[PDB]
Amino acid sequence: NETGAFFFLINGPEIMSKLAGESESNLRKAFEEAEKNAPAIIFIDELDAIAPKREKTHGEVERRIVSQLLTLMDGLKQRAHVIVMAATNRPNSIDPALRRFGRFDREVDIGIPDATGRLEILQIHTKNMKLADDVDLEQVANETHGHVGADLAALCSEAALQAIRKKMDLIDLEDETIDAEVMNSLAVTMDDFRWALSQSNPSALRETVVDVPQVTWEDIGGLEDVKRELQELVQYPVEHPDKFLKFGMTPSKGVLFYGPPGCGKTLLAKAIANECQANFISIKGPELLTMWFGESEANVREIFDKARQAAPCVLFFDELDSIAKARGGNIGDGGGAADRVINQILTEMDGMSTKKNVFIIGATNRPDIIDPAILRPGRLDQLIYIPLPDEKSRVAILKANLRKSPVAKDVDLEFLAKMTNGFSGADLTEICQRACKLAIRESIESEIVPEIRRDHFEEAMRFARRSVSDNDIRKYEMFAQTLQQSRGFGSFRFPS
Amino acid sequence: NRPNRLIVDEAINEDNSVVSLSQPKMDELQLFRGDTVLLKGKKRREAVCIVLSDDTCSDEKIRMNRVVRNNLRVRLGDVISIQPCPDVKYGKRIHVLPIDDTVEGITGNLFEVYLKPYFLEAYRPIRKGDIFLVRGGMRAVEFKVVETDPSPYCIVAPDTVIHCEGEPIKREDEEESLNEVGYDDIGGCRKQLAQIKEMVELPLRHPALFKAIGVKPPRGILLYGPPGTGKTLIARAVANETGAFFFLINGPEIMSKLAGESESNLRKAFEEAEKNAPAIIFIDELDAIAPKREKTHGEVERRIVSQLLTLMDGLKQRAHVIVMAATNRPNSIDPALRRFGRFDREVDIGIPDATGRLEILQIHTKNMKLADDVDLEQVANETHGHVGADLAALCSEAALQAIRKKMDLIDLEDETIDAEVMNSLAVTMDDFRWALSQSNPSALRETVVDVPQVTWEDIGGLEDVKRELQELVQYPVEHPDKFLKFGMTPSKGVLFYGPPGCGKTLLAKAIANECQANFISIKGPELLTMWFGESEANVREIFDKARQAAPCVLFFDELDSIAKARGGNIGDGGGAADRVINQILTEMDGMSTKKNVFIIGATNRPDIIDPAILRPGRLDQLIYIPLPDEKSRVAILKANLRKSPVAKDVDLEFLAKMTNGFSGADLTEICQRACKLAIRESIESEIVPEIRRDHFEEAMRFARRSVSDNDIRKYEMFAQTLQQSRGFGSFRFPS
Ligand SMILES: Nc1ncnc2c1ncn2[C@@H]1O[C@H](COP(=O)(O)OP(=O)(O)O)[C@@H](O)[C@H]1O
Ligand SMILES: Nc1ncnc2c1ncn2[C@@H]1O[C@H](COP(=O)(O)OP(=O)(O)O)[C@@H](O)[C@H]1O
Ligand SMILES: Nc1ncnc2c1ncn2[C@@H]1O[C@H](COP(=O)(O)OP(=O)(O)O)[C@@H](O)[C@H]1O
């Protein structure tokens, strides 16, 4: 519509609804009809019901229709200036014949929008209607994290409809045509939208979502030594290519995060995505075990392919040693440290192009069970260790954690930093959560005050449980000192 | 705003001429309670009935029955003007006669069987031209007023007498037949019927509202539930009570046609209803229509599916038709029809509970009479695994068995049965109990959803845990402001660990009854079935069932059952990870935290639980249930002995003392064994009707503790290691 070209829509089931021969004639007649009206755009609604030639191998007319479409694709020897377009929800459900050059060489992958993108959808679908002063679209874009752009249209339509059933229920204007002096005055409040949020059922919650986290370096307390190392590894080769091309030395492929659990390895991977203005794909532990238990290790190929087209992007693998713990862990089993899920990842990392704006981050907590096949040069060489937080670093963790909720001034976090010795970064989050629950409990109890008090933190000290034990602390130190081994050669000089 | 017009609504009473109004509403008219009220709606018909009292209906509305709605030719969602009429009026000459459509096959007198036990001590202002239905004689009979003294000033009174000629009349299409289905034929479905009522009222009662505005009304309304729940009944009721044309499309009916004709039927079924707007198009079954999951066979099946798909999204406004479909298996629908614009609204209707089932029995037995010793409260308890259609067959068989028992030796060799004997035919317990045995339920393998009736009064002791559970799932749902202001998210779930028999299932069941939410229970073998069957994808449906049934709570009994199957304490060559729990962990990450759902985990061996579930975001709240104390064991026995009356010499305080390692479940078999002795001695001495003290003394010889003595210390050492509240006793600040 914005280019002045004729638009032709070809529906999927529309072709199939015809009998034998007529469906063949419709595709043929749909091309020269748009050819005379050049320029033109030919759009295909769905391709799953048109060319499902993957495992069907059934029906005599299906293959004929697929071949007719294939012949009409490559048969456009210039002549007109028509551009054919198609849309498929499942990238894997397209026959490779149509993916050949000359028929479909350009691929566009559009994903679920983020909160900023979803807010624009709400603004677009509500531009013709008015809203009250206490109505803000910033809040509704946060809880609808697993909503598609079409879900928001239904949400706002239901919110608008519920207003009629609440304000125009007892009026009963028995008129053949509605007026305008009442429709304009019909406002929509929070109570109308909140009811529609509950009734809305998202239709996309199992696929891998891609989003850029809003967490920055200010939300990570301490660990200033690691931040400079990460900023100096993924930001120079992308913004100083000349110094890398002149010396001819290739940039690093990925980084590995190992250390005690709870130090916040996920935050380090999330913060580097927001600084580089790139995407972020996260894979959890059970996501890897699903393929190992399901005897289907080919699902990771789609995960790797999704990150490539979404350039720039970063790849994150949480607790890669989860499969090793499932087969014995420290004691192991009758086999080695090799499995089938990591085998496919290793094969795919070898074939991936190093010139793309992609990066892989590995996270683990047990470095003694990691397969050594990933440490050899070409796959994963940079190993970053996150030690236990110190006294000077624990104050910043609490200061960053207490930013979302206003606190009082008598809370002396410097004192809480001192008695905490083996407390990790995640070991302090439940303390604040338990302290905050007490404020709500006492407010509701005393309702029949609107500030957190000092006594809330004192009570939460009785349930201070450390997630890490004391025996495994030495195992990380002995591993780190063995890996580094910077002894012997103290300081050597030359005579001249 | 002329405060004399009210909106109609369905009545809650089973009487015919009853008008329900609230106490604050009644004084606005300045009128008394016992009198006659005149109703003026539309189509220049009038109606007069008796007004009653209500206290829970609404701010301003009128509740009127279905039979009185037919006289005014009005439907749900319509406005009606009400005015009083305080005048005394009697009756002199009444001439009424029924229609042959309901009295076909009835002989004998038509006065002492239906007219005398209908108007006695009633004083109902029967208006001229009104149509009323009488229930009795184990059938449905309706009459009509043809001619009488000129209305108004007509009320039935004992002074006047009723006369009838004997010949019936012929009805027209102006009046609606009361034999059809309606909103009063639905029982148990309260939360889910309201969604359909509100989703269909606007685009049908006001077709011109959506024609002018650009709001897109929902088109497809897909229905769920096991076969027999009443998906067709609801579809026909919502079309009959809204004045819209109802079109029924059967599943096998399309398939029975040859090639091409089946294609033409679907196409011709749409514009036929388009001209008769508004209309409702209902599809009986979809399993035989679009089974495009693993079939991949047949050339006409895909063509029919694509034709239906094209007819779905091809409804570019034009008319104001609403298409509806019903499928018993939610998983047996192709994703193409689930796309937006074709089927975006999904309604899941389940098996009704005892209260819902009792309404089904009342609905299906309203035309027949029952004896004084007949109560429907008992039969709604044993039929826990019965569908709404099973109860119709049960009551039909109960009614039929009465004929084979009372009308077996009579042998009335007559061409037409009479009415003086059919009405007198009563149905007793012996007729229903025989039908209960012969009835075969058709739904006993699916996961049933019910709200337990157990409250906190049935749980003895454990008062510390109850407050912790009441303070975790009830504040974030009823104080959202204090959670949104501080910005801190509520807890996802809770874990119950401790010695077996303490009653972890009761804690999860009691929290569902207090929150007025559903309850889904998964036992131990239910988890092992997927682990042994190499099919861990069945838990996705379990998770999805709880979401739509909001609010709901999720319960997982003995989650460590799979760990014990692979070695238990000693384990095996692998770790603590498996495939069943992997899917649960993956699904708990993707579930929306803003829904009114909760997950409760129960276990007895905390030393074999996978630590992957304890990390923040999945399951953080761990609640330990210790051994019951002496002060708590008295309450357990007191709550357990509530179902059966006991004597006063049973000193439970003494029984509390010698019990040391006895858990909550360890005391139930003691009471059961004591109660069995009473029955045994009553039957033995038959050739007394109270439990005696000596019954409990004998049961003490078989007092077996389910828990051993070695595992008691393992729970204490685990709890003290988990808590570890030593060291920091009491710290203060200098200033
Ligand atoms: N260094 C840190 N600074 C601030 N917050 C932290 C830090 N480490 C952990 N957290 C908090 O602890 C929570 C749990 O982190 P977790 O998932 O245990 O990290 P990891 O996966 O690296 O062990 C996170 O929500 C995070 O906000
Ligand atoms: N919830 C219910 N209340 C009253 N009657 C019911 C109910 N469910 C089923 N029935 C009765 O069962 C009969 C058969 O219903 P059926 O067509 O099997 O329903 P569905 O199509 O939903 O399986 C109907 O005539 C109906 O009267
Ligand atoms: N604290 C209690 N108070 C009352 N009854 C109890 C209690 N604990 C257990 N029971 C009774 O014991 C019976 C068996 O419970 P059980 O299934 O062993 O619980 P769990 O599954 O938690 O071990 C239940 O029917 C329940 O009525």
- DSSP assignments along A427-463, one per residue: GGHHHHHHHHHHHHHHHHHHH---S--THHHHHHGGG
Cβ B278 under 6 angstroms from ligand 2: no
Phi-psi domain of B461 (left: phi exceeds 0; alpha: psi -120 through 50; beta: other): left
Written as one letter, the residue type at B499 is P
Do the Cβ atoms of A46 and A88 come closer than 8 Å?
Answer: yes
| CB < 8 Å to B346, chain A | 201
Residue A381: Cβ within 10 Å count:
14
How far is it, in rounded angstroms, from Cα B335 to Cα A12? Answer: 14
Cβ B187 under 6 angstroms from ligand 2: yes
Pairing of strands B94-98, B46-54: unpaired
How far is it, in rounded angstroms, from Cα B494 to Cα B473? Answer: 10
How far is it, in rounded angstroms, from Cα B537 to Cα B184? Answer: 40
Do the Cβ atoms of B19 and B37 come closer than 8 Å?
Answer: yes
From B466, B494, B505, B642, mutation site for ligand 3 pocket: most ligand atoms within 8 A of C-beta: B505
How far is it, in rounded angstroms, from Cα B446 to Cα B599? Answer: 20
Pairing of strands A358-364, A254-258: parallel
**Residue A425 CA: distances (Å) to CA of A333, A470, B319:** 33, 16, 62
**Residue B122 CA: distances (Å) to CA of B12, B18, B145, B218:** 19, 11, 18, 46
DSSP H helical ranges for A295-390? 299-309, 322-326, 341-351
Name the nearest CA neighbour of B300 among A283, A59, A43, A430: A59
For residue A131, report the phi and psi dihedrals to the nearest 5 degrees.
-145, 155
Q: Radius of gyration over alpha carbons of chain B, in Å?
A: 32
How far is it, in rounded angstroms, from Cα B167 to Cα B247? Answer: 35
Do the Cβ atoms of A88 and A47 come closer than 8 Å?
Answer: yes
How far is it, in rounded angstroms, from Cα B82 to Cα A320? Answer: 74
Q: Is B467 exposed, middle or buried (0-12, 13-18, 19+ CB in 10 A)?
A: exposed
Q: Say whether A17 and B297 touch across the interface (CB within 8 A).
A: no
DSSP secondary structure letter of residue A204: -
Does A266 belong to an annotated binding site?
A: yes
Written as one letter, the residue type at B545 is K
How far is it, in rounded angstroms, from Cα B578 to Cα B612? Answer: 11
Do the Cβ atoms of A35 and A78 come closer than 8 Å?
Answer: no
* Residues of B (477-506) whose Cβ lies below 8 Å from A: 479, 482-483, 486-488
Cβ B227 under 6 angstroms from ligand 2: yes
How far is it, in rounded angstroms, from Cα B638 to Cα B461? Answer: 11
Which strands sit side by side in the sheet containing B139-148, from one edge to the other?
B131-136, B139-148, B94-98, B162-163
How far is it, in rounded angstroms, from Cα A276 to Cα B141? Answer: 80
Q: Say whether A333 and B212 touch across the interface (CB within 8 A).
A: no
- Which residues have CB under 8 Å from B602's CB, separation 6+? B495, B496, B504, B505, B508, B555, B556, B557, B558, B559
Do the Cβ atoms of A155 and A198 come closer than 8 Å?
Answer: no
- Comparing CB atoms, the residue among A16, A160, A328 nearest residue B573 is A328
How far is it, in rounded angstroms, from Cα A154 to Cα B220? Answer: 13
Helix (H) or strand (E) holding B520: strand B520-522
Name the nearest CA neighbour of B17 among B42, B2, B39, B45: B39
Distance B672 CA to ligand 3 centre (A): 13
3-state DSSP helix/strand/coil percent for chain A, to nearest 5? 45, 10, 50
Measured between its terminal Cα atoms, the distance across chain B in Å is 67
How far is it, in rounded angstroms, from Cα B552 to Cα B566? Answer: 32
Atom of ligand 1 nearest to the CA of A220: 3
How far is it, in rounded angstroms, from Cα B459 to Cα B509? Answer: 10
Name the nearest CA neighbour of A463 among B493, B628, B600, B622: B622
Distance A482 CA to ligand 2 centre (A): 74
**Which runs of E-coded beta strand occur in A185-238?**
none
For residue A297, report the phi and psi dihedrals to the nearest 5 degrees.
-95, 5
Does B428 belong to an annotated binding site?
A: no
**Two tokens at B662?**
């006895």
Do the Cβ atoms of B586 and A287 come closer than 8 Å?
Answer: yes
Q: Is B494 helix (H, G, I), strand (E, B) or coil?
A: strand
DSSP secondary structure letter of residue B418: B
Helix (H) or strand (E) holding B222: strand B220-223
Written as one letter, the residue type at A198 is S
Which strands sit side by side in the sheet containing B220-223, from one edge to the other?
B245-249, B279-283, B322-326, B220-223, B345-347
Q: Is B557 helix (H, G, I), strand (E, B) or coil?
A: coil
Residue B605: Cβ within 10 Å count:
19
Q: Say whether A290 and B7 touch across the interface (CB within 8 A).
A: no
Q: Say whether B7 and A333 touch across the interface (CB within 8 A).
A: no
How far is it, in rounded angstroms, from Cα A265 to Cα A271? Answer: 10
Length of chain A as a residue count = 496
How far is it, in rounded angstroms, from Cα B476 to Cα B488? Answer: 10
Length of chain B as a residue count = 735
Cβ B203 under 6 angstroms from ligand 3: no
Using alpha carbons only, what angle is made at residue A107 by residues A106 and A110, rounded to the nearest 5 degrees? 145
Does B229 belong to an annotated binding site?
A: yes
Does B129 belong to an annotated binding site?
A: no
- Which residues have CB under 8 Å from B664's CB, separation 6+? B460, B501, B502, B503, B628, B636
**Residue B525 CA: distances (Å) to CA of B445, B452, B580:** 13, 21, 12
Name the nearest CA neighbour of B312 among B223, B218, B219, B239: B219
How far is it, in rounded angstroms, from Cα B404 to Cα B418? Answer: 17
**Two tokens at A222?**
């301490």
CA atoms within 13 A on the CB side of B185: 21
**Two tokens at A461?**
């000290």
Q: Is the dihedral of CA B464, B468, B471, B473 positive or negative?
A: negative
**Which runs of E-coded beta strand occur in A335-424?**
358-364, 382-385
Judge whether B336 is closer than 8 Å to chain A, CB to CB. Answer: yes
DSSP H helical ranges for B442-489? 463-470, 475-478, 480-486
Q: Is A287 exposed, middle or buried (0-12, 13-18, 19+ CB in 10 A)?
A: buried
**Two tokens at A112?**
């679920």
In which residue are the tokens 């997630």 written?
A467
Using alpha carbons only, what angle is made at residue B428 by residues B425 and B434, rounded to the nearest 5 degrees? 115
For residue B9, report the phi and psi dihedrals to the nearest 5 degrees.
-155, 160
How far is it, in rounded angstroms, from Cα A174 to Cα A160? Answer: 21
For residue B144, report the phi and psi dihedrals to the nearest 5 degrees.
-155, 150
How far is it, in rounded angstroms, from Cα B720 to Cα B718? Answer: 6
How far is it, in rounded angstroms, from Cα A186 to Cα A165? Answer: 12
Do the Cβ atoms of A197 and B595 come closer than 8 Å?
Answer: no
**Best of A139, A293, A366 to mutate (most B CBs within 10 Å, chain B):** A293
Which strands sit side by side in the sheet containing A6-10, from one edge to the other?
A6-10, A40-44, A83-86
Do the Cβ atoms of B619 and B495 come closer than 8 Å?
Answer: yes
B191-205 vs B231-240: helix axis angle to the nearest 10? 40
Does A365 belong to an annotated binding site?
A: no
Q: Is B322 helix (H, G, I), strand (E, B) or coil?
A: strand
Q: Is the dihedral of CA A452, A455, A457, A463 positive or negative?
A: negative
Q: What is the resolution of this structure in A?
A: 3.4
**Residue A166 CA: distances (Å) to CA of A160, A161, A170, B195:** 10, 9, 8, 14
Residue B395: Cβ within 10 Å count:
21
* Residues of B (606-635) whose Cβ lies below 8 Å from A: 612, 616, 620
Using alpha carbons only, what angle is made at residue B440 by residues B439 and B445, rounded to the nearest 5 degrees? 145
Cβ B498 under 6 angstroms from ligand 3: no
**Residue A350 CA: distances (Å) to CA of A248, A344, A370, A378, B397:** 20, 10, 19, 8, 73
Q: Is B731 exposed, middle or buried (0-12, 13-18, 19+ CB in 10 A)?
A: exposed
Closest Cα in chain A, distance from residue B471 (Å): 8
For residue A442, report the phi and psi dihedrals to the nearest 5 degrees.
-70, -30
Does A265 belong to an annotated binding site?
A: yes
Name the nearest CA neighbour of A223 among A78, A367, A390, A357: A390
Do the Cβ atoms of B527 and B582 come closer than 8 Å?
Answer: no
How far is it, in rounded angstroms, from Cα A462 to Cα B24? Answer: 55
Do the Cβ atoms of B702 and B673 come closer than 8 Å?
Answer: yes
* Residues of A (187-206) whose Cβ lies below 8 Å from B: 197-199, 201-203, 205-206
- Which residues have CB under 8 Å from B516's CB, separation 6+? B451, B551
Helix (H) or strand (E) holding B118: helix B116-119
Name the nearest CA neighbour of B305 among B317, B288, B322, B321: B288
**Two tokens at B189?**
């479905």
**Two tokens at A340?**
């089938």
How far is it, in rounded angstroms, from Cα B166 to Cα B162? Answer: 13
In which residue are the tokens 């497809």 written?
B220
**Two tokens at B129?**
């031209």
SS3 sequence of B1-30: CCCCEEECCECCCCCCCCEEEEHHHHHHHC
**Which runs of E-coded beta strand occur in A226-273?**
254-258
Method in brief: cryo-EM
Closest Cα in chain A, distance from residue B377 (Å): 34
How far is it, in rounded angstroms, from Cα B170 to Cα A67? Answer: 64
How far is it, in rounded angstroms, from Cα B707 to Cα B500? Answer: 7
B580-590 vs B524-533: helix axis angle to the nearest 10? 110
For residue B428, report the phi and psi dihedrals to the nearest 5 degrees.
-110, -175
Distance A432 CA to ligand 3 centre (A): 36
**Residue B222 CA: distances (Å) to CA of B36, B218, B287, B434:** 44, 11, 13, 38
**Two tokens at B285?**
């079954």
* Residues of A (442-481) whose Cβ lies below 8 Å from B: 443-444, 458, 461-463, 465
**Residue A237 CA: distances (Å) to CA of A192, A225, A243:** 51, 20, 8
A299-309 vs A341-351: helix axis angle to the nearest 10? 30
How far is it, in rounded angstroms, from Cα A192 to Cα A159? Answer: 5
CA atoms within 13 A on the CB side of A362: 27
**Residue A223 CA: distances (Å) to CA of A220, A401, A448, A475, B453:** 8, 15, 46, 21, 54
Do the Cβ atoms of B193 and B234 come closer than 8 Å?
Answer: yes
How far is it, in rounded angstroms, from Cα A128 to Cα A156? Answer: 12
Closest Cα in chain B, distance from residue A404 (Å): 7
